[PDB]
Each structure stands twice: as C-alpha cells, then as structure tokens.
Amino acid sequence: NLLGISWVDSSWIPILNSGSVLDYFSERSNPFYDRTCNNEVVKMQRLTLEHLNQMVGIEYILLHAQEPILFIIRKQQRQSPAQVIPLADYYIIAGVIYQAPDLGSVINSRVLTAVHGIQSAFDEAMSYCRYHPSKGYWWHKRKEEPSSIFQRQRVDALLIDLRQKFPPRFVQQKS
Amino acid sequence: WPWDSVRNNLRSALTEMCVLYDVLSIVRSPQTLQLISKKKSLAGAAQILLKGAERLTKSVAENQENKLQRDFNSELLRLRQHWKLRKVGDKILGDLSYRSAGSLFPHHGTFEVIKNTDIDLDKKIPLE
C-alpha cells in the first residue's frame, strides 16, 4: 500500500532537467522519494549504472523517456528486455500518487463522487417537505377566484367607447 | 433545497467529466467487505420499507380504527348515495335543479370539495 502518502513536489524538484531528477531521488532529505529504493544497491560498490536499469535489479527505473516533467518511475524487475511490471505510482505526474490504474479506477472514483452527491441531494430533498395520505393534514384570501358574469359582459363593448371620446395621456414620469 | 441539489449535481458532473477526460488522455484478514456491504444494504432497504409502511399504514389508519372527521371515503359517498348520482363535466355530479319535471330553465351545479384546518369539517360544496 504505497498510495496512502499525499506528498507533493514544491521545493525538492527545483528543476526538471535530466540529471536533477536522479540527484533528487538518490538524496532524500527529508522526503524526496521512497528511501527503500536501490540507491544503496547502486552505490554499494562504486558509481555505476548497471544495477540501476541494465542488470537484474529491483529498482525504480525510467520506464519511458519524459524530460518535461518526470520519467515514469516503475519498479522494473525482469530478466528479459522490454518488460515493466506496474503496481503503483510514486512520481510527481498529475500532482498526485495514484495506483497507476486504467480507466476503471477513474470511472469508479467518478461513480463514487456522483453517488455521494446523489445521496446528499436525496437527504436534502427528503426532510424538506413530504405529501401525506390527506392533503395538508398538518395543524390538526381571495386572489384566484374570478367571479364571471357574462350576462352584463356587454359592458366591455362599452369599454371601447371612452378612449375614443377622450384617450389617456402617457406620462413616462414615475415620480 | 433547489440550489443545494443543483450544486451537488454540478459537482458530480464536474468530477465525472474530469475522470472521463483523464481516462481518455491516459488511453492515448477478517475484512469481509462484501458481507458488511450486504448487511448495510439490507439495513438501508429495511429502513426505507419501514419508513414507507409508517407513511402508508400509520397516517391513514384514522378511519380504520374509529370513524372520525375525514372527507376521504367517508363524506362524498354519503352525500352521493343520499342525494344524486355521479357525473363529470369537470367534477360536477347531479346538481339539484328539478330537471326531472321542471322543464322551465336549466341550472348546473358547481360542487367541489375543499380543505381547511379545523375539527369535524366536511367538504362544504359551494341564487345562493
């Protein structure tokens, strides 16, 4: 379980050059990377690079060339060439240390976030107000009632006889 | 909770879209988690069904134990069986206008139930 750490790169990575990453990862002071790497196995005899990625050694090797940010640090251990066994990700890519999984883990995290949001919305809308068997059974004025007549409705026809005799005067002054 | 649910849905959609874009860009011990999850799901289903049963069979059991004030299934059929029959213009059923033998002039009936917070209150359907 090498995913519980939530570290980031703020000052330990002052530059993203080729030789700076190796010097940063080889000298962890205090936190730069996992101290249980093959740094001691590479510096056991002398300054070389056989035990780093050439020979058979369980070391965090550069699985791919990435000069811009950082190479893909993977625990490379294989007797033959062109092979990488991925189990985690301790690099500074994406500013987080995930499990280096496929679209499965991303879709699972998205579904978890969506389910959390849906549960929150359901809890918020549940205890707001609910209907009952009886309409407003709790606690145990005239703005829609339009009284129609339609007998003397003729008055509306007479309505179009006042503005013709004298029309209103527009003001445009809401004092 | 309109704005709260809207913000929750927006956050969920943002997270889903971010995860989908990340996936697209990348493409080119006595734990017994299952048992605990099944137990929690059973507990949740039981709580939901109990809430439903409390909403249905406990708040509607008024007239089932003793006939009390309730227009639902206790008042409308009374006046129906006692005075007139069912008819649907909108909700107008059997207006009293002596149309059986009047032959003078027709009149309809605007009769409709209403609600009010009180004790022992019927529908009070509306010359006058």
């Binding site: 339009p146 129609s148 007549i149 339609f150 409705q153 509306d156 309505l159 445009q172 809401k174 | 213009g89 909108d90 027709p106 309809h108």
Partner: peptide, 19 residues
C-alpha cells in the same frame, strides 16, 4: 415607464361552465 403598448387581453374572464 410602466407600459408602452395597448392592452385589453389581461382581463380574460374565463367561462369554465361547460355543460
């Protein structure tokens, strides 16, 4: 500036008395 039109429709007294 209340209105700049000629209005007679808003009253719209309904019938709702279909027999």
């Amino acid at each position: 500036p209340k209105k700049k039109d000629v209005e007679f429709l808003p009253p719209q007294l309904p019938n709702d008395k279909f027999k």
